[PDB]
Each structure stands twice: as C-alpha cells, then as structure tokens.
Design a protein around this ligand. Sequence first.
Ligand SMILES: Cc1cc2nc3c(=O)[nH]c(=O)nc-3n(C[C@H](O)[C@H](O)[C@H](O)COP(=O)(O)OP(=O)(O)OC[C@H]3O[C@@H](n4cnc5c(N)ncnc54)[C@H](O)[C@@H]3O)c2cc1C
Ligand SMILES: [Mg+2]
Length: 514
Amino acid sequence: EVFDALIVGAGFNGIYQLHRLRQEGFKVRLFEAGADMGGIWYWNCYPGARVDSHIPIYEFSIEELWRDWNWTERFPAWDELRRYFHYVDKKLDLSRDIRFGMRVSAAEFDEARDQWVIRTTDGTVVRARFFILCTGFASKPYIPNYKGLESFAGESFHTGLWPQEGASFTGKRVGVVGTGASGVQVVQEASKDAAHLTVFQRTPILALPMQQRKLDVETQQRMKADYPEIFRIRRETFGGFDILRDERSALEVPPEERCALYEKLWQKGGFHYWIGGFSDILTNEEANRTMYDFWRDKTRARIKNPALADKLAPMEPPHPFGVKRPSLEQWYYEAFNQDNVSLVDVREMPIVEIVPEGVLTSDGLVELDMLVLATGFDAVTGGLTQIDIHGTGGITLKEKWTEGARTYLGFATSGFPNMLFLYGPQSPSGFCNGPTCAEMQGEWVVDCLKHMRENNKGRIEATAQAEEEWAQLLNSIAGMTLFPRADLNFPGVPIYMDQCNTAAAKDYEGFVLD
Ligand SMILES: Cc1cc2nc3c(=O)[nH]c(=O)nc-3n(C[C@H](O)[C@H](O)[C@H](O)COP(=O)(O)OP(=O)(O)OC[C@H]3O[C@@H](n4cnc5c(N)ncnc54)[C@H](O)[C@@H]3O)c2cc1C
Ligand SMILES: [Mg+2]
C-alpha cells in the first residue's frame, strides 16, 4: 500500500490538501478519525457551536464553491457548516479518497525507501512517501485533574466530546467550567433552558459583540460580485480576514476620533473590534488600554450588578486586550442578570473536589444535574504528539517537543523527514482564519512536493540550525508586541508567508533535499 502522500485530517486543511494534490497528479489518500468530514464541526455539535469568522470569509475561495452556496446567517452554526462540507464533497468528489474511522496512531520512517510506515488503531498500515498532518487546533481536549471528577453522578462531557445524539439543559441544574469560546456559546444556550446555571470562571473572557445577522439568498447574490476581491484582500491581512486595520496611532489621534472608530468597529462586530483598530493597539500598552476601556464600559452597562460587573468586566484588565484570540458573544452578558444564573470566580472560591452531587468550591457545594467541561484544548502540540511518531533522530515527536515546539517555517521538524504539518506550532494558526491559512499554507505544501517531483528529490528534512534560527525570528517578532503577555502562534500571516515563500525560492533553504 504505497502512496505519494497520506493526509490525516478532513477539516479545511486536509480537504484542501486532498483536492489540490489529486489535481497535481499525486496518488493520495486521506485518513479521518471521525465518521464524516468537517473537522471541528464533526466533533463540536454542542448547543450554540458557531464560527467566529464571518461569511464570505470562513469558506473556500474556489469559485465553483461559493458561486452556488448561500449561508443562512453571518455566523453559521456547526450543523450548517456540516452541510457546507457535504456540498464541498459532492462538488470536488473527495470522499472516494477518504477513509473514515481511521485514527492514525503510530508512524515510522523507512530511510532505505524514503517513505513513512503509518499505523492506525484498527491495525491498517500504509506506506506514504510524504506524511501530511492536518490535525488542527482542537484534537486533544483538556480535562483538568480535579479530585473525584469521574465520581460525578450526572451527565458530564467536554464541549469537544458532546454526544452525537444531543442532550438538553431544560429544567436541569447545569454547571459549566471554563469560559472559553465554547463556554460562552454553551452558557448562552443553557441560560434560557436550565433550572439553574452556575459558571466557573478562572479569568474573565473579553468577549466581543458578534453582531449576528440573518441572511437571504437575494442580498448574497448581489454581494458575490465583490467576492473575488474579498478573497484577494483576505490573503494580505494580519490574520487572514477581510479586516483592514486603521494605520494611524491611537495615541496620535484625538480622543473623540478614537471613540468614533471604536464605535464603528463595535457596530460591524466580530473581529472588526479585535483586529480593525489602530496600528499600535497590539504593540503599545497605552493604546491597548483605550480599546479595553471602551469595551469595559460597553460591557459593564449590560450588567446590572456592580459586584458581577467587577467579575465580568474588571476596571483593570487582567491581560492586554486582544492578545489571545477573542471570543464572540450575542447575549452572554445579559444571561448573568437572570435569577437562575450564578457566577463563581475560581480565583476567589477555588474548586476543592468533584463529588457525585456536584462541584465543591471553597465556599460550598454546587449541586448539578449535568457538568459541562468547557475547559478548552491542549496546544497544537498535544494533537500532533498524540500520534506516536518515530523520527530518524531516534526519538518520538512527543519526546522532541517535551521542552517545547521545535520547527522550521512552522511546517517541519529536524529528525522528521518527508513530514509536513498544516496549522502547526509556530505558524499563524490560532491567529489565522482557517480556510485562509489552509489555502495559503496549502499552496506552499503543494509547491514543495511539485518541486521535489520536478527535481527527483525523494527526501526533505529541516535542519537543526534552521529550526534554531526560526525560533529566534518568532521571539524577535513577538518581542515587538504585547502577545507574550498572554496566559506559540506566529503573529502575522503576510510576514509569515513571505519568509516561507522566500525559503522556497532559494530552493528550500533550511531543508536537506535528497
Ligand atoms: C468550536 C470551534 C470553533 C472554531 N471556529 C473557528 C473559526 O470560526 N475560524 C477559525 O479560523 N478557526 C476556528 N476554530 C479553530 C479551528 O481548529 C481552526 O480554525 C481550523 O478550522 C482547523 O482546521 P483544520 O483543517 O486545520 O483541522 P480541524 O478542523 O481542526 O480538524 C482536524 C481533523 O483531524 C482529525 N484527526 C485528528 N487526529 C487524528 C488522527 N490521529 N488520525 C486521524 N485523524 C485525525 C480530527 O478528527 C479532525 O477532524 C474553531 C475551533 C473550535 C473548537
Ligand atoms: Mg534514504
């Protein structure tokens, strides 16, 4: 069973990889662990699961795809995106070369034959010259180590392991642990149904207003005259969105003018307020504060209890604004004004122990019928090192990254020839719009395989020195910004792609080709 490339993952990256490599004449197979395509949208069927990337933006720029597809709303839910991947599948004939239910579990490089020997958990083995890993950001849920967690008598699941058959909150006492992006969404749905909802917060999220909007086929057809421009523009912005920042400095502009821009951005919604402000919002602490202070007053107005507002929207920010990828929200702050909703600050009242009747903080037991763990996911290193990958260096990938992620171009790792990862560590990833990085990173991969086909090279390996230099470039770029003040994603897709494309133009410097 020999192939030019075996792709693991049937999200945007892997779907894109399968389509383009096939088009380029590579014998290719895709192994996806779940039963259907969609990536995160296969696994995340919890109530309220929605994109943070608005329409045109969170889809492929293939003309035959967006010509004949329309969305029901500006930010579609998980089930609508599954419909989008099914439509993509019919149009591009993908699934014939996908094999579902194959979880890749171990792999080993065969230097004599410059090909990978890949093993799934069902025992199937397959040779592939190239090992293209598209496992995403969210393939390893993080469940904290609370004493007695497995003891809980009611229903509990991680948001990334929501039952495929559904589950209702109606009339139940539900507790949600974590206020990440999935927590905000879960909190929104349970707040209208649950007999009581307690939310456990370590740190207040700085949730931005979504500005959701229902959509109609008519207006979308008229807009689609602008779509080719939108898809060109999104390749050229910091995070791959169609959001142009304001080039001025927040500090070099009159205050009434800052409030004007902040109000405009606030009304367009989404990541406009994250990424569309002034140029020094994420390089200058003073400028950063102007945008936090505007969000704080917006939010504190929505909340009726000042003791709550200090917890949800503190006067001092817990970190710099916009340093982590923001969560969106529709009515998340209003839910806390309800009489059936409570907010527990795990900093003040830490969780002592999980018990069958519920969650016991330092100031009492919170009896629950269902316990939702919205505690997020391991870093992208946990989803790649979850496969047992044996490199030509004598160690596993898990072992190679125990001190931290080590890559060149965010694409490869010394000791691991003919292996490339998309949306991997030290690439834009978390700071990027998925389909935008899938397309731009994707073309980089295809070009790389074509270059080796054209030049009779059967082997590529990042060098230890290029690995070292790459880390120094990340630290120097991120050292010019506030991002290291977060609790790594390469900041800047154009800066990123420019380095990648230029290494390729010098015949893949930093790699050894054989
Ligand atoms: C709820 C939620 C909403 C999000 N919304 C957005 C958004 O709006 N915009 C955005 O840019 N990003 C979003 N993200 C982050 C998201 O991970 C990336 O955006 C992106 O879409 C990742 O796409 P992907 O192709 O890289 O992989 P994913 O879509 O993450 O999928 C990876 C696939 O790999 C498969 N796989 C994993 N391990 C194995 C294995 N060992 N063997 C075989 N197969 C395996 C998995 O089953 C999974 O389907 C969101 C994440 C979550 C959790
Ligand atoms: Mg060899």
